[PDB]
Structure formats: structure tokens, C-alpha cells
Design a protein around this ligand. Structure first.
Ligand SMILES: Nc1ncnc2c1ncn2[C@@H]1O[C@H](COP(=O)(O)OP(=O)(O)OP(=O)(O)O)[C@@H](O)[C@H]1O
Ligand SMILES: Nc1ncnc2c1ncn2[C@@H]1O[C@H](COP(=O)(O)OP(=O)(O)OP(=O)(O)O)[C@@H](O)[C@H]1O
Ligand SMILES: [Mg+2]
Ligand SMILES: [Mg+2]
Lengths: 243, 244
């Protein structure tokens, strides 16, 4: 069964963090105990939740107990990114299972891993520790162009590094239905990957970008906005696919 | 003087590639001989210009002649990314000056280096080889939040790795003036960094995102669109700053 879900895509700015935060927010509202782990050196998920920490996931890898590293936020827990992740990108080379072996998260129902836009050791650790992968794909050309290669890479990972890793689903994000490009991109994704693509599409709406500046999830910042409804529906879909 | 300009920002999707391609397009139209080097493993600048090559910057780093690796596109030259760059990220670790030493680009007026969203050896090589840096900053919160740290990192590089590296300017990108968020972000950027922020703001306009799907620059795809006018004005501003 799927417990750990990685939000991954080496393409930058396709909604990995926004999805990790808001998926956690609505999964928590479904009564699930959720842990959000920020593995990006940039630490956007952490900053977007109003947290500034000196200890986080980096220290978990150094033997520190999980319980004393988490921060309570909007109904779930966050294992924060710290400036140490910069060096961790190098230190973890050759150690892709480090996170998997340090994640004593049995107390949680679901664990979300937010990865940086790369195939660095941090992203590899996320993929090696996860059971399912949600791939956010921005409704534009560059993001669409990288899917084929991205899916092949996930297969390489499942080939030996993590045999139980599976694609939970492809999520169309930052979708503006008024543009032909967004329509054409969603169409190509559903034509080639069919059921792999989530039904729910995340629409482009500025409240989603505003939320982080207040350290709030979309459920806290604009509970009735298009993005809120979209992520609420996604949480339901995710649970359906996990079951 | 400034010849090599890096388009860098570890924040993903802030317009590095879109800016590198369109800036090259308008600099070429100003009569400049331009070379665009795609250092991102993703290879978006390459794909966005309709190029699919088996040899590129990786082979340049191996010692192969630059003139036999470039592709002519929209009036300028492209030194393409190749699947070999995935392994280059690991190969260049410890060799931050590899690109600088291999860039025999004296035949070009300007050289643009498109870096990936990270501080990997590829981005480091870009910073160690460039004289100026154009930092694209999406008009939203996350991009704004990273600027301080980014400028600090640029200073570190100048403090040792590359003393000639200088911030050419901060470019506000994907700006939708109809949103209060975009307005507040540009306002804060100019309040905190003033003159460092380019006058030219790139507006959010879908044709800029469409162009790459046709392997065309915005100057080819939609020359009279908001994005095209913006990048044309930017090319002029960059030249003005390069001359200063
Ligand atoms: N649906 C949306 N509508 C509007 N703004 C959005 C939406 N999804 C995300 N954003 C904004 O777009 C930007 C890019 O998203 P985000 O930072 O989540 O991507 P990643 O997390 O994909 O990026 P990176 O590659 O840097 O880790 C952010 O400024 C974010 O607030
Ligand atoms: N001003 C704009 N208006 C509309 N779309 C834009 C604009 N600038 C760029 N885009 C689109 O936004 C996405 C992100 O831009 P781009 O890929 O150039 O960023 P980077 O090059 O910042 O990304 P990465 O971090 O992955 O290298 C692309 O799909 C691009 O086509
Ligand atoms: Mg992110
Ligand atoms: Mg890019």
C-alpha cells in the first residue's frame, strides 16, 4: 500500500511545492495524520508554511529523532528544510537509501516528500523512500516535453533502487482554460497517458501564489477559491488511488 | 567588459530559459554575434529552438572545437545540451572552471549561458565563466523570497571563484499587473534593490510559452506580442548596461 508520496519533476516551477503543501492540507482535513518533508535546498515548502528552522530533515539523516524535529502546521506536521541541504546534495551522493532508512514515520498515515527540480541525491532519496509518485506537469510546452523522459527515469528507479515505486498519477497544474496551449497540453497528456492523468486539474489562480507569502495553505488563505476546490478534489482522488 | 552573461536562479521556472532564448534573439537583431549555451540537463533552450543534437556543450568540455558543435538558429548560434549533461553534473564536481577554460568564444560579441534551477557544478561553471548575471525573478512570493540568498551567493563567487562576476541586473518576469501580488513583488524588488532591477518587466503572456513548442523564438512566433516588445526593450537595456 502507498504511504509515502513524492512530488517530483526535474522541470522547475511546475507546482511540486504548491501541490505538496495543499495536498497535505486537504489530506489532513480528511482525517489523515500527514507528514510533509521538504527535501529542496530552496526550502520553499518550509518558508511557505511560515517556518524557519535550524534543525530538520538533514538532522534526521544524522540520527536525530523525528518527533523532536517536526513542526505543527495547518493540521499536519512538517519536517523542515534547513541551510544544511545545500551540502547534503553532495554528501548524499552514492547514498540513495539514506532517507528511507531514517524515516521512522510509522506514526503517520501519509507522508509527502517535496523534491527539488533536479535528479540530485536529494530527489533520488525521495524516490528511493517513496511508494508512489505524483508528477505535477504545468500546462505548457516545456513541462509537457519532459514527461516521456521523466517516466522512463522513474522506471529506471523502479528497476533496482526501489522496485515498489509506482506512478500514482500525472497532475496537470497551473492550467488556464482560456488559453489554447493549456487545452492542447492537457489533451496530449490524456491522449498518451490516459488514466495515469488525474481527473482533477489545478487551475491557475493567484490565491495559490499568495498563500505562501502569509505562511498559509490555500485552505487557510482562500478556502473557497478555485485552487482550494481543486486541491480538495485532488486529495479525494489521491486517496482513491492509494486504496 | 561584459561579454558572457549567465541567466541564473536556483528557483525553478522563473524564466531563465525564456529569457536566454529571447534575449539572444533580440541581441542578434541589434547586429550582435551571439552564442547561447544550454547548460541545463533538461535541455529546454535546445528543445525550444527546435534542436535535437548528439553533440554539444559536453563535447566542448571534452575538447572538441566549438565551431563544429554550434547550430545556427534565428540569427544566432546555439551550443546544445545533450543527454550527457546528466553525468556532467557529477563529472564537473570539483572543476568549476571547466567551462571558462573551454569557452573559446572570442568570435562572439555576447555569450548567454542558460543554467538549470540549482547550484550544481553546471550552474557553478556558468557563474565561474560569466562576467555578468541576469537574475530572472518571477513576480510571485517564492521567487522574491530567494533573491537575498541568491545575491549573497553571487557575492561568494566573486569573493574567490570568479572576481570578475557582477550582477548585470534583476529581471522581473511573468508579471500580471492585474494581480496585487505581482504589483507588490515588483514594488518590493525596486524598494530593496532599486537600480539593480531592470526597467523592463516581462509581462505574463501565453505566446511566450507557445513559441518553444514551434521551436521558435518570440521574435519569430509573435513579434508584436507583449512579450516580444518586452524582450526587445530588454535587449536594448542589457546593451546599455554592458556598455556602462
Ligand atoms: N495553480 C497555480 N496558480 C497560480 N500560482 C501557482 C499555481 N501553482 C503554483 N503557483 C505558483 O507558481 C510558482 C511555481 O510553483 P512552485 O514553486 O510550487 O513549483 P515547484 O514547487 O514546481 O518549483 P521548484 O521547481 O522551484 O521547486 C510559485 O510561485 C507558486 O506559488
Ligand atoms: N512571461 C511569460 N509569460 C508566459 N509564459 C512564460 C513567461 N516566461 C516564461 N514562460 C513559461 O513559463 C515556464 C517557465 O519558464 P522557463 O522554463 O523559461 O523557466 P526557467 O527557464 O526559469 O525554468 P527551469 O528552472 O526549469 O530551468 C515555461 O513553460 C515558459 O514557456
Ligand atoms: Mg518547489
Ligand atoms: Mg530553464
Amino acid at each position: 500500500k502507498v504511504r509515502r508520496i513524492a512530488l517530483a519533476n526535474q522541470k522547475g516551477g511546475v507546482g511540486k511545492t504548491t501541490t505538496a503543501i495543499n495536498l497535505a492540507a486537504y489530506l489532513a482535513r480528511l482525517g489523515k495524520r500527514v507528514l510533509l518533508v521538504d527535501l529542496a535546498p530552496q526550502g520553499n515548502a518550509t518558508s511557505g508554511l511560515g517556518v524557519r528552522a535550524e534543525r530538520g530533515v538533514y538532522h534526521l539523516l544524522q540520527g536525530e529523532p523525528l518527533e523532536g524535529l517536526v513542526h505543527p502546521v495547518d493540521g499536519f506536521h512538517l519536517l523542515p528544510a534547513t541551510p544544511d541541504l545545500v551540502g547534503a546534495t553532495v554528501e548524499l551522493a552514492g547514498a540513495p537509501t539514506a532517507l528511507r532508512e531514517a524515516l521512522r514515520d510509522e506514526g503517520y498515515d501519509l507522508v509527502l516528500l517535496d523534491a527539488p527540480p533536479s535528479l540530485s541525491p536529494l530527489t533520488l532519496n525521495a524516490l528511493a523512500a517513496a511508494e508512489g509518485v505524483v508528477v505535477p506537469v504545468q500546462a505548457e510546452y516545456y513541462a509537457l516535453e519532459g514527461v516521456a523522459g521523466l517516466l522512463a527515469t522513474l522506471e529506471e528507479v523502479r528497476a533496482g533502487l526501489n522496485p515498489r515505486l509506482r506512478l500514482l498519477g500525472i497532475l496537470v497544474t497551473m492550467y488556464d482554460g482560456r488559453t489554447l496551449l493549456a487545452q492542447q497540453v492537457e489533451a496530449q497528456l490524456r491522449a498518451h497517458f490516459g488514466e495515469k492523468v488525474f481527473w482533477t486539474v489545478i487551475p491557475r489562480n493567484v490565491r495559490l501564489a499568495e498563500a505562501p507569502s502569509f505562511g498559509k495553505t490555500i485552505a487557510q488563505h482562500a478556502p473557497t477559491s478555485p485552487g482550494a476546490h481543486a486541491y480538495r478534489r485532488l486529495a479525494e482522488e489521491v486517496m482513491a488511488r492509494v486504496q
